[PDB]
Amino acid sequence: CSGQVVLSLSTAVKELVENSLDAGATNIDLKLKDYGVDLIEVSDNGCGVEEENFEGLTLEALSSLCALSDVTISTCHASAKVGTRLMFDHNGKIIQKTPYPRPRGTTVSVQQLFSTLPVRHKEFQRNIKKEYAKMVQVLHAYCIISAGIRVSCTNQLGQGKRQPVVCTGGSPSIKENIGSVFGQKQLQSLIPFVQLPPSDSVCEEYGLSCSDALHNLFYISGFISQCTHGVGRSSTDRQFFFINRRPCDPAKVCRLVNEVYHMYNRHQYPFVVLNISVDSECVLLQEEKLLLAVLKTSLIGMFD
Ligand SMILES: Nc1ncnc2c1ncn2[C@@H]1O[C@H](COP(=O)(O)OP(=O)(O)O)[C@@H](O)[C@H]1O
Ligand SMILES: [Mg+2]
């Protein structure tokens, strides 16, 4: 018992979406009922699971989910002649296992999240608006960065009609996924990222010298709102950062990006999509000053 316990709806959805991604899926659907309170279903056309690894499925995030909800999983592996449907108890044990015809892939159903922990379950219901918004940001993050991957999601309140949450088209480019997620009006107020060697004045302010900026292995790419008056946003609600295609919250990078923006638009925060490509062994960050230097210089060049 050394839990990696799913603390939230957003992390439950993150863990789930990443499994699909690690499974080499190209189509990942996410169905939610009552904002996930009643149902969180992640469907994926992936490699699926082989039958000699069923019992091992919970032996990890899936084991925690089981403990915190009623999990049902149907799956089929390329090597499989027929799919399989599995029902797990709260100890991650397989209750039932029956042949089930389905295409290659996996479908994970998390029914009634947190029901085993009354207290956490009510907190979930009371806070729902924030919990859900936190998940949407996580979801959007993966939608934007997953290129060549159709990611869809719908929400259903009670017996009402299904509502739209998001739907990308498997476009091979980030720019297109942004269009899919926030629509074409957002795109028009954006300019692509243009990287520049850190400038002398900026290196000066970051205590950097030639030797410091020579082995710069930072490759930055993405989009940002123009510095044009009004074009921005009213809050930081649409700012996405990634380090090696993985959603994250670099603290310093975030402030820096906003401040450099406020220099040209004191009254608004920008829309931000920023991926930072780096050498894994250099990750927290190893040469931050260089990066911040690169960012500031590059942003300044784009905004003037
Ligand atoms: N959607 C999925 N598609 C394929 N395999 C999956 C999926 N979800 C879980 N798995 C399998 O279950 C294993 C464990 O998942 P999980 O228990 O959450 O652990 P881990 O945190 O190591 O991914 C993975 O290594 C993978 O083989
Ligand atoms: Mg996992």
From Swiss-Prot:
Biological function: Component of the post-replicative DNA mismatch repair system (MMR). Heterodimerizes with MLH1 to form MutL alpha. DNA repair is initiated by MutS alpha (MSH2-MSH6) or MutS beta (MSH2-MSH3) binding to a dsDNA mismatch, then MutL alpha is recruited to the heteroduplex. Assembly of the MutL-MutS-heteroduplex ternary complex in presence of RFC and PCNA is sufficient to activate endonuclease activity of PMS2. It introduces single-strand breaks near the mismatch and thus generates new entry points for the exonuclease EXO1 to degrade the strand containing the mismatch.
UniProt binding sites for ATP: 19, 44, 60-62
Family to which the UniProt record says this protein belongs: Belongs to the DNA mismatch repair MutL/HexB family.
Lineage of the organism: Eukaryota, Metazoa, Chordata, Craniata, Vertebrata
Positions spanned in the full protein: 27 to 364 of 862
Outcome of mutating residue 214 to V: In MMRCS4 and LYNCH4; uncertain significance; normal DNA mismatch repair activity
Phosphoprotein recorded as keyword: yes
Organism per entry: Homo sapiens
Disease: Lynch syndrome 4: A form of Lynch syndrome, an autosomal dominant disease associated with marked increase in cancer susceptibility. It is characterized by a familial predisposition to early-onset colorectal carcinoma (CRC) and extra-colonic tumors of the gastrointestinal, urological and female reproductive tracts. Lynch syndrome is reported to be the most common form of inherited colorectal cancer in the Western world. Clinically, it is often divided into two subgroups. Mismatch repair cancer syndrome 4: An autosomal recessive form of mismatch repair cancer syndrome, a childhood cancer predisposition syndrome encompassing a broad tumor spectrum. This includes hematological malignancies, central nervous system tumors, Lynch syndrome-associated malignancies such as colorectal tumors as well as multiple intestinal polyps, embryonic tumors and rhabdomyosarcoma. Multiple cafe-au-lait macules, a feature reminiscent of neurofibromatosis type 1, are often found as first manifestation of the underlying cancer.
Effect recorded for residue 158 to E: In LYNCH4; uncertain significance; normal DNA mismatch repair activity; no effect on protein stability compared to wild-type; no effect on ATPase activity; does not appear to induce a significant structural rearrangement
Record note on what altering residue 183 to E does: In LYNCH4; uncertain significance; no effect on DNA mismatch repair activity in an in vitro assay, compared to wild-type; no effect on ATPase activity; no effect on protein stability
GO BP terms, alphabetized: mismatch repair; positive regulation of isotype switching to IgA isotypes; positive regulation of isotype switching to IgG isotypes; response to xenobiotic stimulus; somatic hypermutation of immunoglobulin genes; somatic recombination of immunoglobulin gene segments
Encoding gene, per UniProt annotation: PMS2
Effect of residue 40 to T: In MMRCS4; uncertain significance; normal DNA mismatch repair activity
Any one GO molecular function term: single base insertion or deletion binding
Compartments reported by the entry: Nucleus
Keywords: ATP-binding, Disease variant, DNA damage, DNA repair, DNA-binding, Endonuclease, Hereditary nonpolyposis colorectal cancer, Hydrolase, Nuclease, Nucleotide-binding, Nucleus, Phosphoprotein, Tumor suppressor
Top-rank lineage group of the source organism: Eukaryota
Protein name (database record): Mismatch repair endonuclease PMS2
Assigned GO CC terms: cytosol; MutLalpha complex; nucleoplasm; nucleus
Assembly information from the UniProt record: Heterodimer of PMS2 and MLH1 (MutL alpha); this interaction is required for the stability of both partners. Forms a ternary complex with MutS alpha (MSH2-MSH6) or MutS beta (MSH2-MSH3). Part of the BRCA1-associated genome surveillance complex (BASC), which contains BRCA1, MSH2, MSH6, MLH1, ATM, BLM, PMS2 and the RAD50-MRE11-NBS1 protein complex. This association could be a dynamic process changing throughout the cell cycle and within subnuclear domains. Interacts with MTMR15/FAN1.
Phenotypic consequence of residue 258 to K: In MMRCS4; uncertain significance; decreased DNA mismatch repair activity
